[PDB]
């Protein structure tokens, strides 16, 4: 009943676009120690993705300004320290999530499906830290992201249908990590092409509940392939 | 100096869509006690309107959910509403106090006096959207600000000036939503549009885009309120 209230508040926060409140509610649900339902973990990930997402978006705007103000010493320094302040919020949010994942989510995940969900998330938030790390710190963070994604990739390959949104979403993100973080466009294309083609091969495995998410993520996989070829 | 870089920072927060940082920068500028320039007061206006705007938006959503659910899910929505109202009131109070203490006293030109009285009118009006009493006192404070704003601008500014037009736009809305007088809202809006249309030669290259945008909004409201 308490947890059910926290969840109702999270949905309320979501509708009012108050993502800090939504994330605070779902983190409390998480810290009660029980395995999250599908809806709860979906809410937890929506909330935190919006919270970290605002910093990432801010970080890219500020970086672009810091580069394009190369000749103006004062303007460019102000940008560097604004960027650094954003990076600090960003790392704190990433650490908050990664810590929830290690302490509650991953070790208690009793289904392949939720193990893959939480490991994807781990691969994701280390990816977000790798986006703003340097330079020897960056190396171990890149490694943490790749291991989480690699384990999730292996479980999903073994336990989940190719058309499952979580399995597709992991392929999508893991392909993005190769392209963006390890500068490996060909590995990225290979990963995404395989996930796309394997889903195309097994289109009878979509259910009425899954398909809209699956087909969206397939389209995204092929959008990236298109982009990354030309 | 300090001021010049708080402003540059404000501009950087804005491009990053970090409006709490933008407002906090522009609040510090204001608190230094010197008259704001046009750019500075526009940045102050944009920062706080975004900060308060997020609360009003959230408020309309939650309050609507609450009104649609009759009997204890209702309670939850109500207490969330009230928490949002408090944020919103704190923000408006913060602004109204900057207006009274720093901005309205130092305004040396009609243009900028009208600007601040329009702001004062707007922030009292946001307090009004969310008041119940108490409310009568708040509405009156909004009305008196917009009225003085409206008198000064009629005497000192061209009908196409963006500030004068925007004041007419918000005062109009105040009549409509707050005082529940559709006819007076339409008459304020109609006169402001028609007077600008008759004097389009008074548009500057610097101003015309703002002016014509508010003209469109004035008419759009008039359309909505009659049709």
């Amino acid at each position: 009943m308490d947890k059910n209230e926290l969840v109702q508040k999270a949905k309320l926060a979501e509708q009012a676009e108050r993502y800090d409140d939504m994330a605070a509610c779902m983190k409390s649900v998480t810290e009660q120690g029980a395995e999250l339902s599908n809806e709860e973990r979906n809410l937890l990930s929506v909330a935190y993705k919006n919270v970290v997402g605002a910093r990432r978006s801010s970080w890219r705007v500020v970086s672009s300004i810091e580069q394009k103000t190369e000749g103006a010493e004062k303007k460019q320094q102000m940008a560097r320290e604004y960027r650094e302040k954003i990076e600090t919020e960003l790392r704190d949010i990433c650490n908050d999530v990664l810590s929830l994942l290690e302490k509650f989510l991953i070790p208690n995940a009793s289904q392949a499906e939720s193990k893959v969900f939480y490991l994807k998330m781990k691969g994701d938030y280390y990816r977000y830290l790798a986006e703003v790390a340097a330079g020897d710190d960056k190396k171990g963070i890149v490694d943490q992201s790749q291991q989480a994604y690699q384990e999730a990739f292996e479980i999903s390959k073994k336990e989940m249908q190719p058309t499952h949104p979580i399995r597709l979403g992991l392929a999508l993100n893991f392909s993005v990590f190769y392209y963006e973080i390890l500068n490996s466009p060909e590995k990225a294309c290979s990963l995404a092409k395989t996930a796309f083609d394997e889903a195309i091969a097994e289109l009878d495995t979509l259910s009425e509940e899954s398909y809209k998410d699956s087909t969206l993520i397939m389209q995204l996989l092929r959008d990236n392939l298109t982009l990354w070829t030309s | 100096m300090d001021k010049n870089e708080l402003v540059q920072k404000a501009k950087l927060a804005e491009q990053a869509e970090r409006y709490d940082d933008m407002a906090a920068c522009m609040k510090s500028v204001t608190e230094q006690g010197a008259e704001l320039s046009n750019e500075e007061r526009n940045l102050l206006s944009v920062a706080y309107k975004n900060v308060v705007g997020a609360r009003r938006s959230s408020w309309r959503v939650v309050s609507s959910i609450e009104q649609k659910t009759e009997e204890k899910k209702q309670q939850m929505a109500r207490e969330y509403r009230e928490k949002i109202e408090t944020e919103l009131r704190d923000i408006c109070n913060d602004v109204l106090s900057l207006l009274e203490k720093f901005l309205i006293p130092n305004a040396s030109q009609a243009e900028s006096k009208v600007f601040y009285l329009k702001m004062k009118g707007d922030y009292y009006r946001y307090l009004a959207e969310v008041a119940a009493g108490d409310k009568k006192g708040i509405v009156d404070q909004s009305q008196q600000a917009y009225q003085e704003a409206f008198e000064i601008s009629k005497k000192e500014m061209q009908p196409t000036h963006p500030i004068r037009l925007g004041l007419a736009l918000n005062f109009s809305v105040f009549y409509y939503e707050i005082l529940n007088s559709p006819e007076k809202a339409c008459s304020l809006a109609k006169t402001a549009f028609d007077e600008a249309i008759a004097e389009l030669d008074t548009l500057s290259e610097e101003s015309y885009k703002d002016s014509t945008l508010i003209m469109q909004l004035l008419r759009d409201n008039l359309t909505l309120w009659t049709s």
Binding site: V46, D124, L172, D223, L227 | N50, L169, N170, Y176, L224
Partner: peptide
Amino acid sequence: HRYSTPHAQRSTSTPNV
């Protein structure tokens, strides 16, 4: 519906509703 005065390719990962 009534207006007051207004305010004013890269890789795709999994979106957020």
